[PDB]
């Protein structure tokens, strides 16, 4: 008999499993594919490696403005073996940590019908809509098998699509991204995105708006065509990638005969991650909290670790889904916490929203021998709601924006104000100091 059996060795189950492990629980975790799940084998990890890759290509393409004489070629199959070489080592490490802490791992698909508290941690799996030609399509996952390609088309404009198209261009591949609305990234502040799109277009990424693909044709093998509902046609794609969204691995868990609730396959739970049925719990994007979903590795890490506590020491600590810092690893990258300027106004009203923003050029681009206004930009935004100016949203796009936000999030959670930032003496010279002089 186990104190807790973990189903899902991805981000959530693992953390959960090892934490309870730490509190002396007899723990068991069963996995069917490689350990570390989505984030490790087909999300965050490789994605981030390919983002670094595309960063090296730009540095190589531009080293001449820094005194270097450079001639280089890129070979994607190599980036491929290095990167999978890496991934293979993590799985072994995870299985090592799993014996280090006394958890009894089991490889196999899990199914309900010996444990005292059973935790569902089976995240999603990709979504292919009923669209004509969809057979000729692949998913964000599959992209990680691509070692040859001259033209790629992505359908969607969510964060995965944009990160992927920017990584795709910067690897020598001709690139399109189809979007349903007026602009990609419809959920993020529109100014931050105006800068994103301007730069993408500057780098010849083709962005198509108001697109509804009603057909995916296959002239032949690796000669595909994308058909939109308005007359525009787009030919010659070796891969069309659908970045629709993802849905829980919930289909056959032999769950129904348990009256465990289900919205649209997502397992419902409470502040504590408890099911309708007690004993049985759920974290990871495979669930929905209420209802928030929120599919990010660190959130599922929080959840699982915190639960273990209510389960083994004390309840006190619960997961906060409010305030979730994000990084869109686009080119350039985007750091974003809290409300956009418009979300703010939908909540507190325009009479209460003041904004602070900046536009400048990273010092890195000083030697680039080109007209200033053509250098890659950096833009930031402070959205302030109230009277001594609480910061309800914080965003920036640029060189290293991925590394500048974490910290400001510690300050947004502490209800900091324009004035906290203003009394903060800045570090020079850095991109991040601009946040402190928005006067």
Ligand X SMILES: Cc1cc2nc3c(=O)[nH]c(=O)nc-3n(C[C@H](O)[C@H](O)[C@H](O)COP(=O)(O)OP(=O)(O)OC[C@H]3O[C@@H](n4cnc5c(N)ncnc54)[C@H](O)[C@@H]3O)c2cc1C
Q: What are the catalytic residues? A: 428
At residue 268, φ and ψ (nearest 5 deg) are -75, 145
Task: Give min distance, CB of 396 to ligand X, in A.
Answer: 17
Q: Which helix (H) or strand (E) holds 434?
A: helix 434-437
**Is the distance from CB of 100 to CB of 264 less than 8 angstroms?**
no
Shortest Å, Cβ 286 to a copy of itself: 18
CB atoms within 10 A of CB 379: 24
**What's the CA angle centered on 367, arms 361 and 369, to 5 degrees?**
100
9 near ligand X (CB under 6 A): yes
Q: Is 38 annotated as a binding residue?
A: yes
Rounded to a whole number of angstroms, the minimum distance from the CB of residue 301 to ligand X is 8
| 370-429 binders of ligand X (CB under 6 A) | 428
Contact partner, 396, from a copy of itself, ligand X, none, Cβ < 5-8 Å per class: none
The region of 33-41, 95-103, 369-377, 401-409 touching ligand X under the rule CB under 6 A is 33-41
**Nearest alpha carbon to residue 46 among 121, 54, 93:** 54
Residue 271, classed as helix, strand or coil, is coil
Contacts of the segment 227-236: beta carbons below 8 A, 24+ positions apart: 227/133, 228/178, 232/208, 234/153, 234/176, 234/178, 234/208, 236/151
The residue range among 29-37, 91-99, 391-399, 413-421 that interacts with ligand X, by the rule CB under 6 A, is 29-37
- Restricted to residues 57-96, the positions that interact with a copy of itself (CB under 8 A) are 57, 59-60, 63, 65-80, 82-83, 85-86
Interacting positions 395-434 with a copy of itself (CB under 8 A): 400, 402-411, 413-414, 416, 420-421, 423-433
- Please list every residue from 295 through 324 that binds a copy of itself, using CB under 8 A: 296-299, 302, 320, 323-324
Structure tokens at 237: 């794609």
Exposure b/e, 172-182, CB count within 10 A at least 16 = b:
ebbbbbbbeee
d(CA 16, CA 29): 10
The site partner of 155 among a copy of itself, ligand X, none (C-beta below 5 to 8 Å per kind) is none
Binding-site member from 17, 20, 25, 39 for ligand X (CB under 6 A): 39
Tell me which residue has its CB nearest to ligand X. Answer: 10
Q: What does the per-residue mask of binding to ligand X show for 235-274, with x meaning CB under 6 A?
A: --------------x---x---------------------
Q: Does 11 interact with ligand X (rule: CB under 6 A)?
A: yes
* Contact with a copy of itself (CB under 8 A) among 6, 20, 39, 226: 39
Strands (E), 192-244: 206-208, 213-218, 224-228, 233-237, 239-242
Taking a C-beta distance cutoff of 8 angstroms, is the pair 178, 155 a contact?
A: yes
**Which of residues 140, 273, 330, 336 is near ligand X by CB under 6 A?**
140
Going by the annotation, the residues of the binding site for glutathione are: 11, 18, 94, 305
């Amino acid at each position: 008999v186990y104190d807790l059996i973990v189903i899902g060795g991805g981000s959530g189950g693992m953390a959960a499993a090892r934490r309870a492990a730490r509190h002396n629980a007899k723990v068991a975790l069963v996995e069917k594919s490689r350990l570390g799940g989505t984030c490790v084998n087909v999300g965050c990890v490789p994605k981030k490696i390919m983002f670094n890759a595309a960063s090296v290509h730009d540095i190589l393409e531009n080293s001449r403005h820094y005194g270097f004489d450079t001639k280089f070629s890129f070979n994607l199959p190599l980036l491929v073996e290095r990167r999978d070489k890496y991934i293979q080592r993590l799985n072994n490490i995870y299985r090592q940590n799993l014996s280090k802490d006394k958890v009894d791992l089991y490889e196999g698909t899990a199914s309900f019908l010996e444990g005292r508290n059973i935790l569902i941690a089976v995240g999603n799996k990709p979504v292919f809509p009923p669209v004509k030609g969809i057979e000729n399509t692949i998913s964000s996952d599959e992209f990680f098998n691509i070692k040859e390609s001259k033209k790629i088309g992505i359908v969607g404009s969510g964060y995965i699509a944009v990160e992927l198209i920017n990584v795709i261009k910067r690897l020598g591949i001709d690139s399109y991204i189809f979007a349903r609305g007026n602009r990609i990234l419809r959920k993020f502040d529109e100014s931050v995105i105006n800068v994103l799109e301007n730069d993408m277009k500057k780098n010849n990424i083709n962005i198509v708006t108001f697109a509804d693909v009603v057909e995916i044709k296959k002239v032949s093998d690796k000669n595909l065509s994308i058909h939109l509902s308005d007359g525009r046609i787009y030919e010659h794609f070796d891969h069309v990638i659908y970045c629709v969204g993802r849905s829980p691995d919930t289909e056959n868990l032999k769950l129904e005969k348990l009256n465990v609730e289900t919205n649209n396959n997502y397992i419902v739970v409470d502040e504590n991650q408890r099911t309708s049925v007690n004993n049985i719990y759920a974290v990871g994007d495979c669930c929905m909290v209420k209802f928030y979903n929120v599919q990010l590795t660190p959130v599922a890490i929080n959840a699982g670790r915190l639960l273990a506590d209510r389960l083994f020491l004390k309840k006190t600590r619960k997961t906060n889904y409010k305030l979730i810092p994000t990084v869109i690893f686009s080119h350039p990258p985007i750091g974003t916490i809290g409300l956009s300027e418009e979300a703010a106004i939908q909540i507190y009203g325009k009479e209460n929203v003041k904004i602070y923003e900046s536009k400048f050029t990273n010092l890195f681009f000083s030697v680039y021998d080109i007209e200033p206004e053509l250098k890659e930009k950096t833009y930031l935004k402070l959205v302030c709601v109230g009277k001594d100016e609480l910061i309800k949203g914080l965003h920036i796009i640029g060189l290293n924006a991925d590394e500048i936000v974490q910290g400001f999030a510690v300050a947004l959670k502490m209800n900091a104000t324009k004035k906290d930032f203003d009394e903060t003496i800045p570090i020079h010279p850095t991109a991040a100091e601009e946040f402190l002089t928005l006067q």
